[PDB]
Design a protein around this ligand. Structure first.
Ligand SMILES: COc1cc(O)ccc1/C=C1N=C(/C=C/c2ccncc2)N(C)C\1=O
Length: 138
C-alpha cells in the first residue's frame, strides 16, 4: 500500500514480500548478496546508475565483477565479517569511481530476514565541493 523507505525499520520485511518488479521501481540501488557474496538479486535502478546488468551479475560476486578492487577489509571484510556473526549490519559511505569521475555515496548492508541472504542498498549523497589538505613534507 505505502511506498518503500531507505533504511526503514521494516525495509527487509517489505522487500521480502516484494518482487523484482517493484524493486526496480525504487528510487535507489538494491543488491542482494549471498553468504559468499554472490549477486543473488539486482534492481534495475542500480543497474542503470552503475551501468550493470542484473541477469548478467547473477552468480557473480559483488567484489568479483560488480566492483573490481573492492576486495578490502573495509568493504569485503565487513561483508564476510558480519556473515560470521549472523547479522551483517554496516552503514558507511563509499566512493564509486566512474568514467565521468568519482562520486561519494551512501552504503547500507543488512542481513536478510531468512538469514540465507544479505541486502545491500546504495543511495547517492547530496552534491558538495571540497579542497586539498596537503602540507610541506616532514
Ligand atoms: C557500493 O559500491 C558499488 C556499487 C555498485 O552498484 C557498483 C560499483 C560499486 C563500487 C565500485 N566499483 C568500482 C569499479 C567499477 C568498474 C566497472 C567497470 N569497469 C571498471 C571498473 N570500484 C573501484 C568500486 O569501488
Amino acid at each position: 500500500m505505502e511506498h518503500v523507505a531507505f533504511g526503514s525499520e521494516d525495509i527487509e520485511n517489505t522487500l521480502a514480500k516484494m518482487d523484482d518488479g517493484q524493486l526496480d521501481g525504487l528510487a535507489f540501488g538494491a543488491i542482494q548478496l549471498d553468504g559468499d557474496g554472490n549477486i543473488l538479486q539486482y534492481n534495475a535502478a542500480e543497474g542503470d546508475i552503475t551501468g550493470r546488468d542484473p541477469k548478467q551479475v547473477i552468480g557473480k560476486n559483488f567484489f568479483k565483477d560488480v566492483a573490481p578492487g573492492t576486495d578490502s577489509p573495509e568493504f569485503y571484510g565487513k561483508f564476510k565479517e558480519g556473515v560470521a556473526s549472523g547479522n551483517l549490519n554496516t552503514m558507511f559511505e563509499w566512493m564509486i569511481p566512474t568514467s565521468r569521475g568519482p562520486t561519494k555515496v551512501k552504503v547500507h548492508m543488512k542481513k536478510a530476514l531468512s538469514g540465507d541472504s544479505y541486502w545491500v542498498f546504495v543511495k547517492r549523497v547530496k552534491l558538495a565541493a571540497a579542497l586539498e589538505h596537503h602540507h610541506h613534507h616532514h
